[PDB]
Design a protein around this ligand. Sequence first.
Ligand SMILES: Cc1ncc(C[n+]2csc(CCOP(=O)(O)OP(=O)(O)O)c2C)c(N)n1
Ligand SMILES: Cc1ncc(C[n+]2csc(CCOP(=O)(O)OP(=O)(O)O)c2C)c(N)n1
Ligand SMILES: [Ca+2]
Ligand SMILES: [Ca+2]
Lengths: 807, 806
Amino acid sequence: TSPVIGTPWKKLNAPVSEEALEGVDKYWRVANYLSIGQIYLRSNPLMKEPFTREDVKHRLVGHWGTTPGLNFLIGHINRFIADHGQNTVIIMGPGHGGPAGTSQSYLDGTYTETFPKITKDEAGLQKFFRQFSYPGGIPSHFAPETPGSIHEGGELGYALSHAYGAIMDNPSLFVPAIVGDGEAETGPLATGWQSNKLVNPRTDGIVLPILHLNGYKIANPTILSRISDEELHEFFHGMGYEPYEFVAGFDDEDHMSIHRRFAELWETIWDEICDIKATAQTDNVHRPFYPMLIFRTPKGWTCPKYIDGKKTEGSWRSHQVPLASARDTEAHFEVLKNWLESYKPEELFDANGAVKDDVLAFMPKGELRIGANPNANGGVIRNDLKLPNLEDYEVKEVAEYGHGWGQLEATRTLGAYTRDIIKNNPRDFRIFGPDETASNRLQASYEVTNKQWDAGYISDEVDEHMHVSGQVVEQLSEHQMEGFLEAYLLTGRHGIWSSYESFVHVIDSMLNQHAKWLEATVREIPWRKPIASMNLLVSSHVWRQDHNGFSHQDPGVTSVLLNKCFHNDHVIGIYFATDANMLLAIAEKCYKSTNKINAIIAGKQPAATWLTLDEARAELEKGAAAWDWASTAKNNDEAEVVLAAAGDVPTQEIMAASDKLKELGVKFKVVNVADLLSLQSAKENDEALTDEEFADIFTADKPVLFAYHSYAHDVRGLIYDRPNHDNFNVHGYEEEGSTTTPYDMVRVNRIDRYELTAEALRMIDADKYADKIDELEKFRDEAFQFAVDNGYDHPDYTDWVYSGVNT
Amino acid sequence: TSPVIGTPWKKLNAPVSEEALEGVDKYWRVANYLSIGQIYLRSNPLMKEPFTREDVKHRLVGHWGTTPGLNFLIGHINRFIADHGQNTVIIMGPGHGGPAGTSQSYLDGTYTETFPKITKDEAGLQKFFRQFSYPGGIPSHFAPETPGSIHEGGELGYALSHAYGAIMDNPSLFVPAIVGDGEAETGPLATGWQSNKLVNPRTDGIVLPILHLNGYKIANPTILSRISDEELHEFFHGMGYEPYEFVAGFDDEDHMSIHRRFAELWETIWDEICDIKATAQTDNVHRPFYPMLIFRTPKGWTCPKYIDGKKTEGSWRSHQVPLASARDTEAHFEVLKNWLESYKPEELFDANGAVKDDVLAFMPKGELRIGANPNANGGVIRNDLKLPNLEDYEVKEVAEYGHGWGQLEATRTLGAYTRDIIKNNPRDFRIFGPDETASNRLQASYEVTNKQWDAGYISDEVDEHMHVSGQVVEQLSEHQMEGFLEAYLLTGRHGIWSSYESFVHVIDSMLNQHAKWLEATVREIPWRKPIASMNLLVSSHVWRQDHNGFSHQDPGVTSVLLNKCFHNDHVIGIYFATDANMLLAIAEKCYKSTNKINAIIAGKQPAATWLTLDEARAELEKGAAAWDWASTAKNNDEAEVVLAAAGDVPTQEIMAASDKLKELGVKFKVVNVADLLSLQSAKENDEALTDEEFADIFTADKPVLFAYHSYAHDVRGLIYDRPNHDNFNVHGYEEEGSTTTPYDMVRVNRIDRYELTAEALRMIDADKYADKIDELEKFRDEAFQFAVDNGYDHPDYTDWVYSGVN
Ligand SMILES: Cc1ncc(C[n+]2csc(CCOP(=O)(O)OP(=O)(O)O)c2C)c(N)n1
Ligand SMILES: Cc1ncc(C[n+]2csc(CCOP(=O)(O)OP(=O)(O)O)c2C)c(N)n1
Ligand SMILES: [Ca+2]
Ligand SMILES: [Ca+2]
């Protein structure tokens, strides 16, 4: 549960002191100096003579354009924090402005506190400049390596979804969220503005959007800087914001005036925020118009206005570096020298190379500092969830009537379970879902909380299970749902979201970035404590999108997640819920886990339950398992074939194939896979099955029929170095399907029980069985023709029950 | 170029007649009946007695909620088209309203012209209802098997990108883009609204966005319907639209009153659009406010208000079926029967079960029909590109100075080639880039066209190569760029977009949906003529994201595109451009290709040119090739190791490693792979190398060191049944990287020349060569330490040049 830090939502009531503003100007000037330094200088940080091109980096890596803008804002936010004692986390949309984030951390004292090698003296200042975007050094973005960051801003557009996740169930948290005007052109950013109808000003914190309207992205102007100011204002008002606009640096107005104007404006907005928060103590059912700030300043603010006759300040040319080289010529190095001198470092640094005390006297102390605030390292806040007994959700009926029982909808059991997680962990757990929580069958959670909704109510006949405050949130944007949950985890809370499988792909790129964040964190950032896993229920999956058709039939998220399964990072979970009981086992493991993206593939369709809780726990701990009770073979030598399934439906088709093989008197072994990564080469993954364990399950010499939920390519590439790999005959989804019957879905993809049975015969003795094979292919066409003619499936397919079930 | 159809941008100058609105009401009623029919009925389409339980489908598949609103709008649009002669393509954002699109096709006559068994009689009606979302019948969405569809709407969000793409260079085309109020909550849709700053009312057509504000998505209200009307209007006005709102169906207003108000509003919005189009002939540097329409009607409109005491009209409950079963009880059956009778079908059908002439008399005829419009079968519009002679762009310096010459930036040649395609094919070719065209080094295009920009200008010192019309469009949104080009293609034109490799992932799901579109088309839609291919330049790739770091290091698009490579559909291309010359040869194949998505992985960094064109073309046609001139072994028995590379940089490190193995006297074959699918099993893919050709290139029995651009998993999974697949040692990107140097990038992923040379020697004799392996491992840390001390790479890495250079 988020901590109450500082003295939240306090008005100042006095003007901002001239003293504190002189601080901010110094912060600004020194942060700009540190920022140019990190880009340009390998040595001689303070320009002690002789200062020459030998001091300048060979390759210029880093972004200036965004950075002076960031430095001004952060300077002013640091003043704000100190004077008000406000719990504040910043979201740096333009994450390519990493020099501003490292500067902030250097100057607030979290950098030295975290990297003691980087000292508050000339020598520390020198390693500090060299390390930036430099071999064996630090990233060029506001990376997880930087104290203060929960958002890299590498991949643009998640600034607002991250900002609004952070404040959820975080009533003391202020989040000034800085958004690139280029970033604002992305789809994820454009929908993120609407988050203000999904948060409550009493129970959640406050996000102040700051649009960094610097006029440009890389090689273009931005749309929002070149529409009318009037359009820009209606735009933000229409999305439920009170827009304030600040314009500085397009004229000769001196720095002190700029700082005085800004500080008055900032305090006027803050006053408005303190009134929103004070009102919300009495009235949290009326949605307020939340302030947002349009920060219009020239890109590259304070760089040379022109370089080699090209406009540089207030241009896209300042995007990366305004001065392409400071080595090629003396005239160029001279521009660097002048530029660095214009911040007057002689005033900012004492002879020992430390920043003077009067630069940083206005700065916050302790856990209020941007870099030290525990919300920016949410691991330190994160508690274990109080979990209910998994026993109470177990489908007991498998133990009663045998493996293969029933027509249960597995995701309902995950719903009962998550419901009680929310009940027992209020303010600490959230379900997100893109208008799919009921569709994926997770609505049992509506018994103990509601869908959070802070737009209009109209009627009890339609507005069911909705309140201004609640642990479930739903918007039709996978981006928003991935986004909110990511930031809710980064600030030390927990959750699950669900998606139709096909549409997980919408946020493939966001899985990549959070995976990279997690990969970087577990390799080389041990100060950044572990966060709860991004748990993702993948359901309404390909084999039962027979009702929605081809658009909804893509299980390929499996393939994407496999490209983040390296270096024994163990940040990817890929689980196949065989049934309700396997789903509970996976669920508990995932909800206990940390530093992972967990993807749980589970059906919502009525389906058999195969395992007891115990059998599922067992299969899950190793990842795969022989099903002895299902196997006509007694050991691997007797076995003529290995029937292996991954996914609840493949399991179903394999078990049914197994009953037809059973009647022809074939000896076969049945294998279930629940953990895809258990099959990964034991060379690449220390948690996979050993080649010995693998060979014991898949036999080493017998052919294996593998029925796989997703695309067969996934397995053929996982097991390339595995014992017996060349005897694996892998069936998976094959881009066949439409709106049809469950049976046609498996049939047309050659993973139906009939084809599986036939395939198993072909692989034992083709000629010996030529006629039972030919009988099976004929029936395959007859059952299809039965569906075409009757509009439901042949009763052979429909009415089948595993032989192992008794009345 | 898009053809001019009908009489575009024409005002009525008259009231909509009573006759037409009577027809629109009959259209609306019959579309509703045909829609419910398609959902509910296996037989007895006209409820001839006995009409029972048994005439109802066992399983209800389809969506009612959106359908009556869609039927209403499409009814009014059909009237409009006929009255105006207006070249009109609709975008059905709520594509789950399929029955609206099927009904429309069946009613405009294109259904029976395209599918002769589905007749305009009771037998046809019976087939038409049964086939909907039924095994061996047709899809539940507005799929490509539906005449008049260029947009399925299964994956919501792309309504507006497709709308705006359709109209680029399409000045006669009007696109009513119907948007879900739920769909409007998606990221892609939210930014799609801003496209009106990137289109020009003279050189492009007009999109009319229609917010289908029926108040609900599946199980929730929509944000846009439960905020104040003032906010809703401010929002659209802020985004450069003049918002008009229509409210109907919440009260007892008679249907004719509703049609009269709507038709009046509609012609008012159409008048403004005609004014914008007339103004734009004279002035087109001043962006107008484009009308958009807020359509506020209750979800499931005209279904029973309450069923079993639950509100169904004007509720999320109407989303799928307002009536969950019509077979379970007599009373539910009566609700279906009553509902169907509420449209009074006996006034709509003749004794033969044909829709009465008086119902369809207002409809468009011929190519104006939504179903017949060539823009919805763009392949009937597509011409072959007038391509310049590929010879004129070849790096000739490989003939003169030899194989491995130069520090050329390969994308720059594609830029020149593509420039001249635009000069030769004006209004038929477009570049899209998310603010990355210059960065990907395609700026040569600016010599003949401009970035299209219809927001504001301030200064010649910043606004270079921008004009209100131009064939290059940037917006920082992959969705927008992908979406725009998808529709430019679907409406019968050509182009390419570029993206940083890592960020192609943003639009993974749009590749999926476009792939699936082309999969269904080549399999069973022979009447949908072939479209130009979706050409994607994948550059600023993982091996040269040394300057941005980990975030920008993901070449995993290859992984995604492999999951659409089946049934010999041949709709995916994955090409690695070895160099400028291989790039020119891939470009040419891709630009001539139809019905494809082509990923072209090309380096923008300065690199060696390896092949001449003639050789490049020979490698491509096969997909892979023995490099005879680079091999020290002169047959497959002689060779102790095969060195294979796919990708400009894995190639580089393989060629450099071949020099180190030459000096050791080692006998090796050098193999380059340009078509990733050439390697795919011969059983799955009939255009792959035969097992024979495969074993002949990679040898039957020798160790192969494969240096791969992307995730090794790709190549491993492709070759599982190939000759000698077990001897493949595949190296690729491994999620190692940072902000560092070119050499550190290959080093940390174990694909630098040094490691490859060591890995070659490990595969021959770990024993014989232990001494040389250890030397090469030590030189890796020594060349990393060099980079750390100095801030640039060791000259053995930096300055290296292939032995074969003069
Ligand atoms: C999703 C995505 N697409 C493309 C890029 C490439 N990119 C990185 S920075 C940038 C421009 C950023 O412009 P803006 O947000 O206006 O930033 P600022 O002016 O503050 O530097 C672009 C196109 C990206 N980082 N992420
Ligand atoms: C990208 C995407 N995410 C989720 C879904 C699942 N989905 C199908 S229809 C729908 C709701 C549709 O709401 P709206 O756009 O309001 O359509 P209408 O009410 O007109 O049916 C949802 C969430 C989808 N089809 N596509
Ligand atoms: Ca910007
Ligand atoms: Ca809707």
